[PDB]
Amino acid sequence: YTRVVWCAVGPEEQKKCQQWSQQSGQNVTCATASTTDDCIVLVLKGEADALNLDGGYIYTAGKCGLVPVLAENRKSSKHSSLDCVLRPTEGYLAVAVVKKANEGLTWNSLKDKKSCHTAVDRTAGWNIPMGLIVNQTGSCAFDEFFSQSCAPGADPKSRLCALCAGDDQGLDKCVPNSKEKYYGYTGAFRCLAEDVGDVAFVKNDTVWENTNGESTADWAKNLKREDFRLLCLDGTRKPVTEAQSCHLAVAPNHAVVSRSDRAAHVEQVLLHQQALFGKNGKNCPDKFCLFKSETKNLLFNDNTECLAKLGGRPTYEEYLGTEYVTAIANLKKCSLEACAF
């Protein structure tokens, strides 16, 4: 009676779900879809129960009447008086990153350059950057601003995927799941790292997690923090040590959403699943760890300490915040009252 069905996006998140499933006593089983939007639809239909989402998609899902249930929490200095689950989230910092070697590249000369985005409609990788740029340009022509990009989820032979690489066998070019090589936080940063783009729109954490031997991967093991700069909105450039005074915005933590008729039931099971497989669980890191996959962020971000209860029972609008939700509306009028599905 108590069983939850997770929705996995793409073949890699599937395999990871399958393990979680088997290690759970079929307390959690799996559904798989090729895109986040398709997983949202599975959940509305009632064939899946839940998944973890970037704030940009929480805005989609919430118009269709889905609700935040538990949020991700990463390591925190302040607020250490308290327990992670009852501990307040903070929100990550969205940044624009460049090679140090590229002098002359400022927030003011981004026109006609090459760009690396997490995916279309995501907070740090899309809504923040393109919102600012529509504003400063007064045009909805965000498809003509950069010469070429990789923006997973756009038309495959527009210039917005022009830089995307697809899977081993060259298939799936710019699909929005991890088969695409430059998908998500890690892929967008790899995109700038390998000098395919001139800038990448990721979050502060991503730079740290993938420089200075912090990530054991082939493309990144020789990357070094001092080789990068952040672009600030006042036209200057700073070390990645200054993210606190040189970001584009702060962003709501990714959160697990479900259909509201299912929210209590999902919350109940997951809090128990993190007790077995979480950051200090009975069975992690012995048998299985929910918050770990090789710097991939599969199902969850790897820097997740825990899933946190929500303060005060949010609506998705309260959780996303008033500031970020007007940002999104203003952008969507470019490309008020109806589900996308």
Ligand X SMILES: COc1ccc2c(c1)c(CC(=O)O)c(C)n2C(=O)c1ccc(Cl)cc1
Ligand Y SMILES: *[C@@H]1O[C@H](CO)[C@@H](O[C@@H]2O[C@H](CO)[C@@H](O[C@@H]3O[C@H](CO)[C@@H](O)[C@H](O)[C@@H]3O)[C@H](O)[C@H]2NC(C)=O)[C@H](O)[C@H]1NC(C)=O
Ligand Z SMILES: *[C@@H]1O[C@H](CO)[C@@H](O[C@@H]2O[C@H](CO)[C@@H](O[C@@H]3O[C@H](CO)[C@@H](O[C@H]4O[C@H](CO)[C@@H](O[C@H]5O[C@H](CO)[C@@H](O[C@@H]6O[C@H](CO)[C@@H](O)[C@H](O)[C@@H]6O)[C@H](O)[C@@H]5O)[C@H](O)[C@@H]4O)[C@H](O)[C@@H]3O)[C@H](O)[C@H]2NC(C)=O)[C@H](O)[C@H]1NC(C)=O
Ligand U SMILES: *[C@@H]1O[C@H](CO)[C@@H](O)[C@H](O)[C@H]1NC(C)=O
Which residues are documented as binding site for hydrogencarbonate? 118, 122, 124-125
Residue 289 engages ligand Z in binding (rule: CB under 6 A): no
Among 315, 330, 334, 341, binds ligand Y (CB under 6 A): 330
Among 135, 241, 268, 280, binds ligand Y (CB under 6 A): 135
Residue number, 25 or 170, with CB nearest to ligand U:
25
CB 133, min distance to ligand X, A: 22
Q: x/- string (CB under 6 A) for ligand Z, residues 9-38?
A: ------------------------------
CB 130, min distance to ligand Y, A: 8
Residue 295 engages Fe ion in binding (rule: CB under 5 A): no
Annotated binding site: 54, 92, 118, 122, 124-125, 185, 254
Q: Kindly report whether the peptide bond that precedes residue 252 is cis, defined as omega within 30 degrees of 0.
A: no
Residue of 252, 235, 232 lying closest to 243 (CA atoms): 232
Residue of 337, 328, 336 lying closest to 122 (CA atoms): 328
Residue 288 engages ligand Z in binding (rule: CB under 6 A): no
Which option in Zn ion, Fe ion, ligand Y, none does residue 326 bind, with CB closer than 5 to 8 A by kind?
A: ligand Y
Residue owning tokens 């398709």: 38
Annotated binding site for Fe(3+): 54, 92, 185, 254
Residues 22-61 that bind ligand U (CB under 6 A): 24-25, 27
Residue number, 57 or 228, with CB nearest to Fe ion:
57
How far is the C-alpha of 95 from the C-alpha of 45, rounded, in Å?
36
Amino acid making up residue 20:
W
Residues 112-131 that bind ligand Y (CB under 6 A): 128, 131
Residue 212 engages ligand Z in binding (rule: CB under 6 A): yes
Non-local (6+) Cβ contacts of 273 within 8 A are 20, 24, 27, 28, 290
Residue 214 engages ligand Z in binding (rule: CB under 6 A): yes
How far is the C-alpha of 26 from the C-alpha of 244, rounded, in Å?
43
Residues 41-100 that bind ligand Z (CB under 6 A): 75, 77, 93
Q: Which stretch binds ligand Z (CB under 6 A): 57-65, 152-160, 208-216, 314-322?
A: 208-216
Residues 262-321 that bind Zn ion (CB under 5 A): 318
Residue number, 310 or 325, with CB nearest to ligand Y:
325
Residue of 122, 52, 89 lying closest to 291 (CA atoms): 52
Residue number, 28 or 327, with CB nearest to ligand Y:
327
Q: x/- string (CB under 6 A) for ligand U, residues 275-294?
A: -x------------------
CB 188, min distance to ligand Y, A: 18
Please report, as ranges, the residues that interact with ligand U according to CB under 6 A.
Answer: 2, 24-25, 27, 276
Please report, as ranges, the residues that interact with ligand Y according to CB under 6 A.
Answer: 128, 131-132, 135, 323, 326-327, 330
